[PDB]
Design a protein around this nucleic acid. Structure first.
Lengths: 263, 239
DNA sequence: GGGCCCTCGATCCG
DNA sequence: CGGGCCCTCGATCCG
DNA sequence: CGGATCGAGGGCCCGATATC
DNA sequence: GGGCCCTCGATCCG
DNA sequence: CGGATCGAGGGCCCGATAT
């Protein structure tokens, strides 16, 4: 009787996330702030939804796929389950930045394995993965075709969160920076050719999954904090009820109305 | 030419120690004796087969990557007198007591992790493995029926093993109400790629277990490959 | 002396 | 077992 | 200086509901 | 609650 | 010594039903 959904937050904790740009909170602290915001809403509203947490670029390896020397810097901190206060306390202070770097696509595969195995039976209505990275780490394009195929077959939606915001398609996208502020919320020159290459791959993947408008699902940590886009994919239909628009006599259009705006 | 690798996987759950109200040895006792018989036969025959004995569902865990509840009693190595003597400590009703004392039983396991350790055991062999085979001795027809995650992960790792070249053969033991392949073991076990599916029945006697084990024991070894010439032009090849 | 039998050694294939 | 509705109190200011 | 008003409580109908 | 259907058990004759 | 019969089992629809 309620909209359930399996959400897995895939956070980059690599050393480079600890690398901080003057004035701006380090992408690690920025992603942490966004994750805490998400979990906080899911916890205090007591919504029935299970949340898993995967961290990539950690010093150690605790992952089911670690067999084979593969994914040795990806740790599944939280398995798919209803979020609790212990999880919020761990995100707030227990989870510390790591010294290694991982392949963000490899981490995405770990998250996918979590969804594929812990979602058995129509227990969950929606499947969603949220990647939090800076793209500064090198990566391999080997299974990208398979990643996209497995995402479609499993019906899992994606959402990317970077320290920088999408520059305007043509022209435009540097003084003071304020997290959550409108406008100057990311260094225009801070992008690295490595970040640019990762971004092009991110763009292609989002377009391959949700078409041309998939690119709108790539946010910056700052703007993500001043929007409800983090819940977009797990957002519940407004409660609707049926009636009849009665014009006169004999004309009666069968309708169904819902509350568009409600405080 | 090459040395064959064979790993004996034995279930150590609460159900395995029950003699199903009969004169027959408990499925665990049946397994231990069957394994011992294979070891002796391998010593008698002149075959370079490397054997291993791995237990799962035990409280005490001893393995390469320290996975909980997995005890690798014997690594992949040639059969020896000392190895058979070690298995003899578990043979019988008195041996069951010796097993429960040395290591625990009926502990929560994870079949996914069990196959990971086993595959990692073949990884550590240097001589060319002609055949990789795992023989699962268990009486639980639907393990992890309650845990959905452990069951799907086990199905996935079984697929990964079949894609590697490892053979998975089931040695289902007496279960109250019969043993069902459809619940579990139907897809995990490796079936012949040219169909030949639903081929063996549940084992009740040691003689039956030994006959199924020894049938898939060694891969068919052709003495010679000759040409069967029906006519100057019609020639088929036979082994 | 003749049949018997077993154990190695030398000959080739998988 | 929920959803919308509506009223009754309680706390804040203006006349 | 009491009213007027608005957040945030409380109480009755009505489609899904395990129930005979 | 009402109709349905099947499977035994108890009742008598060949 | 089988039929016919009659309880008392089993499984799907439907007005009151706490939800």
């Amino acid at each position: 009787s309620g909209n359930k959904a399996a959400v897995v937050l895939c956070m980059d904790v690599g050393f480079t996330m600890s690398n901080s740009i003057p004035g701006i909170e380090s992408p690690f602290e920025q992603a942490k702030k966004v994750i805490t915001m998400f979990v906080q809403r899911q916890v205090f509203a007591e919504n029935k939804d299970e949340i898993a947490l995967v961290l990539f670029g950690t010093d150690g390896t605790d992952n089911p796929l670690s067999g084979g020397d593969q994914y040795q810097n990806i740790t599944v901190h939280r398995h798919l389950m209803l979020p609790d206060f212990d999880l919020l306390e761990d995100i707030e202070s227990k989870i510390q930045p790591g010294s290694q770097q991982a392949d963000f696509l490899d981490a995405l595969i770990v998250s996918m394995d979590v969804i594929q195995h812990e979602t058995i039976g129509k227990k969950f209505e929606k499947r969603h993965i949220e990647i939090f990275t800076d793209l500064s780490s090198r990566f391999s394009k080997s299974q990208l075709d398979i990643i996209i195929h497995s995402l479609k077959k499993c019906d899992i939606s994606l959402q990317f969160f970077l320290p920088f915001s999408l520059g305007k398609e043509d022209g435009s996208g540097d003084g003071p920076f304020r997290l959550g502020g409108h406008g100057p919320s990311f260094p225009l020159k801070g992008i690295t050719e490595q970040q640019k290459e990762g971004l092009e791959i991110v763009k292609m993947v989002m377009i391959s999954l949700e078409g041309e408008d998939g690119l709108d699902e790539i946010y910056s940590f700052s703007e993500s904090l001043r929007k409800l886009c983090v819940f977009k994919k797990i957002e519940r239909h407004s409660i609707h009820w049926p009636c009849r628009l009665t014009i006169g006599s004999n004309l009666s259009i069968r309708i169904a109305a819902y509350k568009s705006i409600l405080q | 030419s090459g040395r064959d690798s064979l790993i004996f996987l034995v279930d150590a759950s609460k159900a395995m120690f029950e003699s199903q109200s009969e004169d027959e040895l408990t499925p665990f006792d049946m397994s231990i004796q069957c394994i011992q018989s294979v070891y002796i036969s391998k010593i008698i025959s002149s075959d370079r087969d490397l054997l291993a004995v791995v237990f799962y569902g035990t409280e005490k865990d001893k393995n390469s990557v320290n996975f909980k509840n997995i005890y690798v009693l014997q690594e992949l190595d040639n059969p020896g007198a000392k190895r058979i003597l070690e298995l003899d400590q578990f043979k019988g009703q008195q041996g069951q007591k010796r097993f429960q004392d040395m290591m625990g039983h009926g502990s929560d396991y994870s079949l996914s992790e069990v196959l990971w350790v086993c595959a990692n055991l073949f990884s550590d062999v240097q001589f060319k493995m002609s055949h990789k085979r795992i023989m699962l001795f268990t009486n639980e027809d639907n393990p992890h029926g309650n845990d959905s995650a452990k069951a799907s992960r086990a199905r996935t790792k079984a697929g990964d093993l079949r894609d590697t070249g490892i053979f998975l053969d089931l040695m289902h033991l007496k279960k109250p109400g019969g043993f069902d392949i459809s619940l579990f073991y139907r897809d995990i076990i490796s079936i012949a790629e040219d169909e030949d599916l639903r081929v063996f029945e549940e084992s009740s006697k040691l003689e039956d277990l030994l006959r199924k084990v020894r049938a898939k024991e060694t891969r068919k070894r052709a003495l010679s490959r000759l040409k069967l010439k029906l006519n100057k032009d019609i020639v088929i090849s036979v082994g």
